[PDB]
Amino acid sequence: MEVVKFMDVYQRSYCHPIETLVDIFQEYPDEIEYIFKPSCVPLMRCGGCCNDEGLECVPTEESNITMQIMRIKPHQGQHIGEMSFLQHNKCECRPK
Amino acid sequence: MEVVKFMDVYQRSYCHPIETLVDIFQEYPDEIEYIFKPSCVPLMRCGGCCNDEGLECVPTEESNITMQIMRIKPHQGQHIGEMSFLQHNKCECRPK
């Protein structure tokens, strides 16, 4: 059986940017008159644990990534265009 | 600037197993008298989108992964022990 060693689990779970699949409407809530394809996008976002309830995992560097996304108005045409999304490039455990 | 091309976003977002950080208490709700270090673990879990509201992304192959976790409980001190977690090895879009 493969067992993940403690120090590896700890390092791999600690606060860091991790690819996270995010629904486009979480980021563009006012665009719900459209259907988007794909409907979700992979974004780097802070995730994981700090193992100290006085601390939270928060971004320390942010930027935007642009992706080609198809926009559909039901029963009308499709159009592919650029959409930008917030990413987290660096993460740290900071006091809450 | 980098722009992710449509077909690449579509492929990268589509229903598949993705590393997901999961709180251990969520997987072991019976053990809330424990403190775990780390408090979360990275698990392969189905994620992403199917781009069809008739379909949902669900596991088609499942197994357990075992990890060394520091377990802390009154009268046992802190000790490392094996804990197993459900993982999704294969994912498919299936009718809801």
Numbering used by the authors:
A (entry chain V), B (entry chain W): 12 to 107
Paper text:
VEGF‐peptide 2 c mixture crystallized also in a tetragonal form that contained no bound peptide. The main backbone displacements occurred in the 83–89 and 35–46 loops, that are flexible in molecular modelling studies as well. Moreover, the conformational exchange involving the flipping of the ϕ dihedral angle of VEGF Asn W62 was already noticed in several crystal structures of apo‐VEGF, which assumes that the two conformations are in dynamical equilibrium in solution.
We proposed to use this peptide as a model to rationalize the thermodynamics of α‐helix stabilization by an i to i+4 lactam bridge. Although only lactam‐bridged ExxxK, DxxxK and KxxxD induced the formation of stable helix in the unbound state, all peptides of the series were helically folded when bound to VEGF.
